[PDB]
Amino acid sequence: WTIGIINRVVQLLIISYFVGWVFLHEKAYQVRDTAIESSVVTKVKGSGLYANRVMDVSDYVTPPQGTSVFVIITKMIVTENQMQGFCPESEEKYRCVSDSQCGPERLPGGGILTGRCVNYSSVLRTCEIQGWCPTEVDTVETPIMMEAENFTIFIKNSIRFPLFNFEKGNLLPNLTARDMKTCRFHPDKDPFCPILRVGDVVKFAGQDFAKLARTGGVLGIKIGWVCDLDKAWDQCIPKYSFTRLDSVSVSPGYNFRFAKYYKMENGSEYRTLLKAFGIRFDVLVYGNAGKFNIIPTIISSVAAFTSVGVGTVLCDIILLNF
Amino acid sequence: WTIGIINRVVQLLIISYFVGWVFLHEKAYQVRDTAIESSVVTKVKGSGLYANRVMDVSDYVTPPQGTSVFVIITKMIVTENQMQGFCPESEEKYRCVSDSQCGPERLPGGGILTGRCVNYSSVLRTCEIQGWCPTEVDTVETPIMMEAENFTIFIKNSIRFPLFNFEKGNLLPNLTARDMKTCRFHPDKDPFCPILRVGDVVKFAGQDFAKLARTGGVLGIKIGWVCDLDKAWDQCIPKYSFTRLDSVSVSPGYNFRFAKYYKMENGSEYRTLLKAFGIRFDVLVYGNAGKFNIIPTIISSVAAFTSVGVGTVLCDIILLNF
Amino acid sequence: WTIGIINRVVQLLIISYFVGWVFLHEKAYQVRDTAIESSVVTKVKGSGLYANRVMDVSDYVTPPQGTSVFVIITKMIVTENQMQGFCPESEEKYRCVSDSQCGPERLPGGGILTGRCVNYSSVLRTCEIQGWCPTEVDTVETPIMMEAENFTIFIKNSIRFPLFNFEKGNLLPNLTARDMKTCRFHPDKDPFCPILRVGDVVKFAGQDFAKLARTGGVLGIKIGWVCDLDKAWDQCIPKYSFTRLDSVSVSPGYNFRFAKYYKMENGSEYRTLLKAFGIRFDVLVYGNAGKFNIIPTIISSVAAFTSVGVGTVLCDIILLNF
Numbered sequence: 001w002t003i004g005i006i007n008r009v010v011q012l013l014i015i016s017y018f019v020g021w022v023f024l025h026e027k028a029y030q031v032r033d034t035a036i037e038s039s040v041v042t043k044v045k046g047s048g049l050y051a052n053r054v055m056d057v058s059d060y061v062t063p064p065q066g067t068s069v070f071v072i073i074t075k076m077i078v079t080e081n082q083m084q085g086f087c088p089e090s091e092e093k094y095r096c097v098s099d100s101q102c103g104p105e106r107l108p109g110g111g112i113l114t115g116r117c118v119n120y121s122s123v124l125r126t127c128e129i130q131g132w133c134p135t136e137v138d139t140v141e142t143p144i145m146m147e148a149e150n151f152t153i154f155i156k157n158s159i160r161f162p163l164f165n166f167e168k169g170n171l172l173p174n175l176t177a178r179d180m181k182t183c184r185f186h187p188d189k190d191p192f193c194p195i196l197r198v199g200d201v202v203k204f205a206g207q208d209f210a211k212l213a214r215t216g217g218v219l220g221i222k223i224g225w226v227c228d229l230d231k232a233w234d235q236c237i238p239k240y241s242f243t244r245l246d247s248v249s250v251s252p253g254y255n256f257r258f259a260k261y262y263k264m265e266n267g268s269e270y271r272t273l274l275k276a277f278g279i280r281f282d283v284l285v286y287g288n289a290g291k292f293n294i295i296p297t298i299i300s301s302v303a304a305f306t307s308v309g310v311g312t313v314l315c316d317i318i319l320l321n322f
Numbered sequence: 323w324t325i326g327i328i329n330r331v332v333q334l335l336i337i338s339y340f341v342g343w344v345f346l347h348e349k350a351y352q353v354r355d356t357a358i359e360s361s362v363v364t365k366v367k368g369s370g371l372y373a374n375r376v377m378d379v380s381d382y383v384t385p386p387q388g389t390s391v392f393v394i395i396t397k398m399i400v401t402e403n404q405m406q407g408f409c410p411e412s413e414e415k416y417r418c419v420s421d422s423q424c425g426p427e428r429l430p431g432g433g434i435l436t437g438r439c440v441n442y443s444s445v446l447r448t449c450e451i452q453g454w455c456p457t458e459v460d461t462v463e464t465p466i467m468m469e470a471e472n473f474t475i476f477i478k479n480s481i482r483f484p485l486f487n488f489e490k491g492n493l494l495p496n497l498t499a500r501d502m503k504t505c506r507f508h509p510d511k512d513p514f515c516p517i518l519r520v521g522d523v524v525k526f527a528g529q530d531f532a533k534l535a536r537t538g539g540v541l542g543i544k545i546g547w548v549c550d551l552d553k554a555w556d557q558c559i560p561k562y563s564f565t566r567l568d569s570v571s572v573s574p575g576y577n578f579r580f581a582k583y584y585k586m587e588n589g590s591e592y593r594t595l596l597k598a599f600g601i602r603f604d605v606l607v608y609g610n611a612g613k614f615n616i617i618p619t620i621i622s623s624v625a626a627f628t629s630v631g632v633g634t635v636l637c638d639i640i641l642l643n644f
Numbered sequence: 645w646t647i648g649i650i651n652r653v654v655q656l657l658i659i660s661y662f663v664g665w666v667f668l669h670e671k672a673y674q675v676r677d678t679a680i681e682s683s684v685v686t687k688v689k690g691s692g693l694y695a696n697r698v699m700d701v702s703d704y705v706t707p708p709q710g711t712s713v714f715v716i717i718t719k720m721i722v723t724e725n726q727m728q729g730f731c732p733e734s735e736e737k738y739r740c741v742s743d744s745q746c747g748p749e750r751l752p753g754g755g756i757l758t759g760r761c762v763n764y765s766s767v768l769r770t771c772e773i774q775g776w777c778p779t780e781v782d783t784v785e786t787p788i789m790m791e792a793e794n795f796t797i798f799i800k801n802s803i804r805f806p807l808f809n810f811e812k813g814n815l816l817p818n819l820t821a822r823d824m825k826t827c828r829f830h831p832d833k834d835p836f837c838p839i840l841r842v843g844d845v846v847k848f849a850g851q852d853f854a855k856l857a858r859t860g861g862v863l864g865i866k867i868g869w870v871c872d873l874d875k876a877w878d879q880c881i882p883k884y885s886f887t888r889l890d891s892v893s894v895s896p897g898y899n900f901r902f903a904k905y906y907k908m909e910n911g912s913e914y915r916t917l918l919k920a921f922g923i924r925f926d927v928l929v930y931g932n933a934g935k936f937n938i939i940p941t942i943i944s945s946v947a948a949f950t951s952v953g954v955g956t957v958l959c960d961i962i963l964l965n966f
């Protein structure tokens with residue numbers, strides 16, 4: 001009967017259309033390179049005021065080379081003119097009543113205890129320690145550099161998909177609305193401008209610059225390179241997203257210690273101990289490209305052929321039985 | 323004959339069970355994301371004694387920011403109060419008999435030779451050089467900071483599988499036996515505590531802290547995120563492993579040079595040249611996730627269907643022929 | 645007819661040979677690990693002359709630890725003995741006629757303006773600023789360190805394919821023609837020597853050391869680990885390639901700022917501000933391994949079986965119809 005082939009032809013049309021659209025949607029004919037090879041060069045610009053001092057890129061940016069991870073110092077605690085010696089620790093956790101509880105068994109991971117119980121102040125009595133004296137007092141409150149909100153981060157990113165040897169950069173003057181020197185990234189108005197405003201990055205991550213600068217934190221500038229290398233070079237485009245990575249028992253924030261080492265004319269050594277709170281920026285470059293390939297196209301082909309060949313039988317059984 | 327379908331039914335049961343278990347074991351129905359996107363923040367804690375000096379995190383940890391690669395300095399060689407000028411190199415390799423063998427053709431990659439053969443000491447005669455004087459003597463023996471064995475490394479790791487947009491952290495208070503502030507990673511007792519004892523890490527890597535601290539080395543704290551995103555969020559868990567990466571013509575160990583730059587009141591410049599031996603720690607975050615997908619499930623389906631369809635024919639040929 | 649099976653047998657021979665060679669060429673029977681896990685330790689060696697000063701590894705290499713990204717400083721601009729205060733900016737862009745155009749609304753991202761229009765020189769009048777004085781003059785011309793062309797970069801690379809747990813290093817004494825201590829990488833004569841001549845790396849990247857050292861730049865030492873883990877351990881070999889990553893509205897080159905901080909005996913602080921131009925080196929380790937696997941071999945098998953089964957029908961239709 002001719003209707004039998006009109007029923008079968010309809011079966012193949014519909015079923016083959018479902019399978020076809022499904023496989024075509026997932027790019028099942030494409031080999032994928034998900035091992036992007038990226039280089040990141042960052043440049044921070046701005047100047048701020050902290051106490052009655054002016055901080056420039058050489059003062060608050062660390063490291064200086066413009067790597068993918070850098071830190072903008074927003075608040076800091078200074079302990080000036082430290083020198084090796086003995087002194088009573090100012091941390092209450094080191095409180096003692098006699099030299100019998102200042103032995104090596106107490107606070108094993110802490111500082112070096114001399115074994116004497118000494119009077120830090122009239123209200124506290126702590127174990128004496130050998131090290132940089134006086135000791136740090138990290139419980140005071142200090143200001144934060146507010147101008148850091150207006151600083152700019154310029155990200156030059158040069159990536160390459162090695163499976164296809166397709167390398168490209170994120171400096172695209174044609175895609176930017178304004179000049180590169182004066183543009184400013186906006187997710188909607190200028191989403192390809194490589195210049196980001198620090199405060200902007202803090203907002204895109206859903207963070208308050210006040211609390212963040214106060215406690216420090218870790219933000220991620222995410223560069224995504226999802227690309228169809230079957231299309232034009234013009235179509236492989238970077239997409240920027242933003243997130244706070246420290247998020248959140250453990251106290252939030254981000255700080256690290258470093259000293260400025262000075263020596264006296266008579267030769268003795270003394271340092272300035274600095275506890276730095278700031279916003280660390282991690283440039284995270286993800287990317288995956290898809291290029292047409294014979295092997296995945298054949299495997300997907302056989303898959304759709306056989307799958308349709310079974311679906312038509314099952315649909316005949318469902319129809320005829322009814 | 324009915325037995326013919328009892329033989330065929332048994333064929334399909336057994337063969338289909340083999341194929342089924344095989345494909346089900348390898349998660350052939352899952353798409354895999356092997357491009358984890360990780361952020362690492364490290365914090366070292368401890369104090370040590372070197373010579374008659376006390377080293378704190380600002381003295382022996384480099385860099386300070388808490389990156390994925392950092393160095394704990396265990397032994398160092400100091401050459402104090404260097405100043406630009408001319409002096410005889412102390413390296414024997416520069417030995418000379420006359421100014422005729424101190425020309426630019428000799429040791430091209432080394433220091434800057436003035437062209438004079440001078441007497442470093444009464445027992446050695448070396449080419450004179452222009453640079454920081456006096457020169458370094460890196461053949462002496464110096465102590466090592468033993469307290470570094472008791473230092474602690476705290477690793478906060480925040481990763482994300484982008485193909486699925488599944489981001490998670492390694493601070494899991496529910497999985498840890500003790501409090502986060504006081505716990506300590508143990509592969510068996512507390513395998514999710516992010517706090518590692520330096521000496522412990524040295525042991526897990528099969529290394530002697532004495533020799534390692536003496537010669538320096540490169541260890542890797544490996545964080546693995548193998549995850550089945552079909553299961554609960556609770557099931558995606560990090561697993562820590564440890565290894566020595568420098569391992570091993572070339573002399574083992576790890577050291578690097580840096581100077582502390584001082585200036586005189588009259589304005590002349592002089593530095594302290596430091597050769598640092600320590601244990602570099604590389605946080606290596608691997609991970610791959612698997613999520614059920616329609617395309618791989620269909621491809622695997624067709625594969626098992628056809629493969630069974632052929633296996634039953636071959637098994638009929640093997641049975642009937644016998 | 646017997647010829648019918650001689651036509652079919654020829655069909656299967658030829659078609660099955662095409663399909664077979666195609667699938668065998670692309671390693672369709674292999675699972676692939678494209679998430680290499682690499683560790684990079686770099687060591688720079690050399691000494692140069694800048695002005696009448698000698699620069700050693702502690703002077704021009706930054707950072708010092710030997711990471712995968714480091715900078716060899718070739719030219720620099722010094723601004724000595726800066727001190728916090730007020731002074732007229734030397735940048736023409738800050739030119740003013742009266743204190744009415746030195747308000748906060750002007751150059752928002754720049755330095756801190758006091759609000760006064762002052763005379764930097766007799767030929768220029770600029771806004772006064774608070775910060776490190778005097779200000780930097782980055783428009784002068786300075787020399788470049790030419791000896792940096794003869795410096796050597798030693799790259800120790802230790803990688804691991806985790807899906808197969810196959811870890812290996814790039815120090816291969818058997819593969820090198822010369823001793824490791826004295827060899828020197830040559831793409832043809834010694835392509836496995838880990839010691840690279842800086843000038844050589846500049847040439848392999850198609851760059852002129854004069855212009856590059858003058859303006860600075862970003863080069864990539866690419867280490868590729870394409871491996872067939874079905875073959876011998878001896879066959880997994882690294883291949884080195886080279887490229888300039890900054891390439892290229894924006895001014896080319898690479899520079900960054902850092903200061904040397906000194907303090908006076910009376911306690912006042914003053915720094916030496918340094919603008920550094922050099923060649924940043926990014927070690928980029930790519931790699932992907934392929935190991936025989938049952939699942940991909942079965943999927944590829946079914947694919948070739950069905951594809952041939954259809955190709956023979958189509959070829960019968962093409963032949964018989966003719």
Ligand SMILES: *[C@@H]1O[C@H](CO)[C@@H](O)[C@H](O)[C@H]1NC(C)=O
Nearest residue numbers: 104105108109468469471472
């Ligand atoms: C580590 O600390 C313990 C105290 O908890 C102490 O007994 C031990 O001697 C320390 N180890 C070293 C190497 O100092």
Ligand SMILES: *[C@@H]1O[C@H](CO)[C@@H](O)[C@H](O)[C@H]1NC(C)=O
Nearest residue numbers: 172173174175232233234235
């Ligand atoms: C950039 O713009 C010019 C217009 O003058 C155009 O010819 C060129 O193709 C553009 N490049 C890309 C990558 O679109």
Ligand SMILES: *[C@@H]1O[C@H](CO)[C@@H](O)[C@H](O)[C@H]1NC(C)=O
Nearest residue numbers: 083263264265266267268269
């Ligand atoms: C160096 O001088 C300072 C004060 O000028 C003094 O505190 C210190 O003890 C001196 N160093 C030595 C080793 O005497």
Ligand SMILES: *[C@@H]1O[C@H](CO)[C@@H](O)[C@H](O)[C@H]1NC(C)=O
Nearest residue numbers: 426427430431790791793794
């Ligand atoms: C590099 O060293 C060789 C000696 O091996 C020397 O002849 C040459 O001039 C050096 N190159 C530069 C740029 O100084």
Ligand SMILES: *[C@@H]1O[C@H](CO)[C@@H](O)[C@H](O)[C@H]1NC(C)=O
Nearest residue numbers: 494495496497554555556557
């Ligand atoms: C953590 O512990 C609480 C117990 O109060 C539990 O309700 C919560 O689900 C746990 N979180 C995870 C991720 O297991």
Ligand SMILES: *[C@@H]1O[C@H](CO)[C@@H](O)[C@H](O)[C@H]1NC(C)=O
Nearest residue numbers: 405585586587588589590591
């Ligand atoms: C600075 O003084 C030191 C000794 O105080 C001396 O060695 C040096 O030559 C002086 N510098 C100059 C340029 O005279």
Ligand SMILES: *[C@@H]1O[C@H](CO)[C@@H](O)[C@H](O)[C@H]1NC(C)=O
Nearest residue numbers: 146147149150748749752753
């Ligand atoms: C940022 O700059 C603008 C001028 O463009 C200024 O009005 C604003 O106050 C600045 N923001 C901060 C936090 O100083």
Ligand SMILES: *[C@@H]1O[C@H](CO)[C@@H](O)[C@H](O)[C@H]1NC(C)=O
Nearest residue numbers: 816817818819876877878879
């Ligand atoms: C290195 O060389 C020795 C020759 O003495 C050889 O036995 C060994 O197998 C070689 N190693 C590799 C990895 O080829």
Ligand SMILES: *[C@@H]1O[C@H](CO)[C@@H](O)[C@H](O)[C@H]1NC(C)=O
Nearest residue numbers: 727907908909910911912913
């Ligand atoms: C410290 O001395 C220098 C000159 O020796 C002077 O310029 C500066 O004003 C002094 N500092 C203070 C706070 O007086």
Ligand SMILES: [Mg+2]
Nearest residue numbers: 091136137138
């Ligand atoms: Mg404290």
Ligand SMILES: [Mg+2]
Nearest residue numbers: 413458459460
């Ligand atoms: Mg030496």
Ligand SMILES: [Mg+2]
Nearest residue numbers: 735780781782
């Ligand atoms: Mg300027």
Ligand code: NA
Nearest residue numbers: 303624625947
């Ligand atoms: Na298939």
